[PDB]
Structure 1
Amino acid sequence: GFRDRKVMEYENRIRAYSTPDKIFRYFATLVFMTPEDFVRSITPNEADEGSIFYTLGECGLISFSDYIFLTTVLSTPQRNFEIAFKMFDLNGDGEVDMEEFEQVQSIIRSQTSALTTYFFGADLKGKLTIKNFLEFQRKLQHDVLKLEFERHDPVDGRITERQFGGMLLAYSGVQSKKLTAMQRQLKKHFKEGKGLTFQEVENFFTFLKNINDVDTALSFYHMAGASLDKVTMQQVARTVAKVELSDHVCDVVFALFDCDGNGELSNKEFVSIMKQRLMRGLFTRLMQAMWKCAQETAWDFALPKQ
């Protein structure tokens, strides 16, 4: 199907760019939102009884401000999220009242019955603490990751290496049109491989999410022309992200990304991509692209020293 193909391409494109109001208006009922529609809007090219989305489904339709808050809780890392919470709390005591939360959520109302029942009681009184806040953070992130995992049809509770590589390359919204060839080659490169159990990809995704600190943690490798390595990646993931990584996952990431290199995975190869994609918070599809391409080409050409 060609027409449905271009429809899904345009939906994915409007998902990638111009998110805040255009997406929320693009998915609705009949001005509010529904949880399954939210899940549809957060997944590209596309009732629970145990999920968070079930709890919201029991609750009333989601608001636009709630949508913004959900985007931020999905986006920001853990430490920055703790800082954001500390900024949420206006009063001294470490508990966000319903009134101050209402103020800092109404501050987003620019185009001029919420998730409160999950944070507060039906009386809209029960104030929460930082512990419940981080618990909701972790629960929502693990839940969306579980949903994405199960969307890829698993075998024996496991996922082909090509599928994991495709999910990874889809996480960083970069269309190199050449890394897809590496994704395709990963299958034969890992002929009759393992199944990449959910815990391995979970650990790798939490590590990738906590990369803003990983970058500054290995800053000595930068400023020295150094390049990454298997053991060093193991170490930095164990120290900063505080989680283990199986050697197979590091192997498949190396095989996916270290294309120009010979197994070293320098800054421009892997870390820069994720560090830039984590900062998404800041025919027309030809001008800017061609300009950037030409700029890079001219820079590479002029790269002939003094």
Structure 2
Amino acid sequence: KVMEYENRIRAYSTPDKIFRYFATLKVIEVFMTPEDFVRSITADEGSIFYTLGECGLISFSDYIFLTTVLSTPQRNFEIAFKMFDLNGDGEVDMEEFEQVQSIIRSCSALTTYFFGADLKGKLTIKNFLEFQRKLQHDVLKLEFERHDPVDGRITERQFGGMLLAYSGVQSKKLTAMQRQLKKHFKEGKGLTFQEVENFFTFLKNINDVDTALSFYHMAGASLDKVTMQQVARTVAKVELSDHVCDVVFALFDCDGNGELSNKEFVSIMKQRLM
């Protein structure tokens, strides 16, 4: 019951309650060890949370910033960086970041990682995009290896579980089809990490995929595998394997017509982005 409670306050309660619920260290103000951040959603060298595992801990400004970095597409993150840049020089400093941090609140980890030890550094667009990329990647890698993989491959039931967990909608029909995903693939050839990461990269760019798919929406047409792969390769620069769209069509196609309509797939994964 208390796990369901924390799941629901993760679902709809304010991040003010969530950070104050998962933080462990208080100062003068409360701080969270990065492990509380990997817990709030769910490290040897190369991992992100070790390069951020050095002193100190994560403030409330750093928590909100991380959550809005994870839940934002790329070409909107570029506009966000341009918004940060008050002076319009093209390189963000610590002062503008401090201003928007104050606005957020109404620390070492984030600001010493970004602007260096003495904070005297200045940011650019490439470091910002690369930080977002590494964050999302090493969140996904832990989400993946969390499912007890075997030979670096997960079965399609667990991949369907991941998909419906991300979708944020749980209905008995969809859960039944998720269970049936085992019956559909009696042998199973697993799902590597690359295919899963590629599909979630496709899912992050869904609000642009929808714009590129407007003729199919107005004409009333539906989405088969080939057009899904084409729009993925054109919009999200991803190479959707045949097996990932196989599983997606076996999962989200409730009416069994063989093809996804706008209300079946794109609307769900678009409104999940809110």
Note the alpha carbon deviations across 1:12-67, whole angstroms, 9 max, x for none.
11111123211111111151111111110111xxx333211112211211010111
In structure 2, what is the Cα distance between the partners aligned to 1:26 and 1:177?
A: 31
Q: Would you say the 8 A contact 1:59–1:115 is kept in 2? A: no
> Which TM-score applies when normalising by structure 1?
0.85
Note the alpha carbon deviations across 1:65-115, whole angstroms, 9 max, x for none.
1111101100010000111001111112111110111001111122xx231
Q: Would you say the 8 A contact 1:95–1:128 is kept in 2? A: yes
In structure 2, what is the Cα distance between the partners aligned to 1:32 and 1:160?
A: 38
In structure 1, what is the Cα distance between the partners aligned to 2:222 and 2:17?
A: 41
2:108 aligned with 1:99: no
Q: Would you say the 8 A contact 2:54–2:109 is kept in 1? A: no
Correspondence for 1:202: 197
In structure 2, what is the Cα distance between the partners aligned to 1:52 and 1:116?
A: 15
In structure 1, what is the Cα distance between the partners aligned to 2:35 and 2:173?
A: 34
Correspondence for 2:243: 248
Match of 1:222, SS state, is helix
Note the alpha carbon deviations across 1:170-210, whole angstroms, 9 max, x for none.
01111212211111100110111111111111110000011
Shift of 1:261: 3.9
> Which TM-score applies when normalising by structure 2?
0.94
Shift of 1:128: 1.5
In structure 1, what is the Cα distance between the partners aligned to 2:14 and 2:54?
A: 26
Deviating beyond 4 angstroms after TM superposition, the runs of 4 or more aligned structure 1 residues are none
Distance change in 2, residues 1:261/1:225 (3 Å): farther
Q: Would you say the 8 A contact 2:55–2:109 is kept in 1? A: yes
Correspondence for 2:183: 188
Report the number of matched residues. Answer: 266
Q: Would you say the 8 A contact 2:233–2:239 is kept in 1? A: yes
Gaps of 5+ in 2: none
Of 197, 204, 207, 1:212 maps to 207
Q: Would you say the 8 A contact 1:213–1:240 is kept in 2? A: yes
Note the alpha carbon deviations across 1:235-254, whole angstroms, 9 max, x for none.
00000001101101101000
Shift of 1:126: 1.2
Of 133, 141, 145, 2:136 maps to 141
2:157 aligned with 1:158: no
Note the alpha carbon deviations across 1:109-137, whole angstroms, 9 max, x for none.
22xx2311111111111111100110101
Note the alpha carbon deviations across 1:237-293, whole angstroms, 9 max, x for none.
000001101101101000000012411111111111011xxxxxxxxxxxxxxxxxx
Give the % identical residues: 100
In structure 1, what is the Cα distance between the partners aligned to 2:14 and 2:127?
A: 28
In structure 1, what is the Cα distance between the partners aligned to 2:37 and 2:211?
A: 34
In structure 1, what is the Cα distance between the partners aligned to 2:81 and 2:131?
A: 12
In structure 2, what is the Cα distance between the partners aligned to 1:272 and 1:258?
A: 13
Match of 1:251, SS state, is helix
Once superposed, what is the RMSD of the aligned Cα atoms?
Answer: 2.3
Note the alpha carbon deviations across 1:141-180, whole angstroms, 9 max, x for none.
0000001011110010110110011011001111212211
Match of 2:216, SS state, is coil
In structure 2, what is the Cα distance between the partners aligned to 1:248 and 1:19?
A: 38
The 5-angstrom pairing of residues 218-297 of structure 1 reads: 218-275=213-270
In structure 1, what is the Cα distance between the partners aligned to 2:96 and 2:158?
A: 44
Match of 2:161, SS state, is helix
In structure 2, what is the Cα distance between the partners aligned to 1:59 and 1:243?
A: 36
Q: Would you say the 8 A contact 1:28–1:37 is kept in 2? A: yes
* Structure with the greater alpha carbon radius of gyration: 1
Gaps of 5+ in 1: 1-5, 276-305
Q: Would you say the 8 A contact 1:16–1:173 is kept in 2? A: no
In structure 2, what is the Cα distance between the partners aligned to 1:274 and 1:127?
A: 36
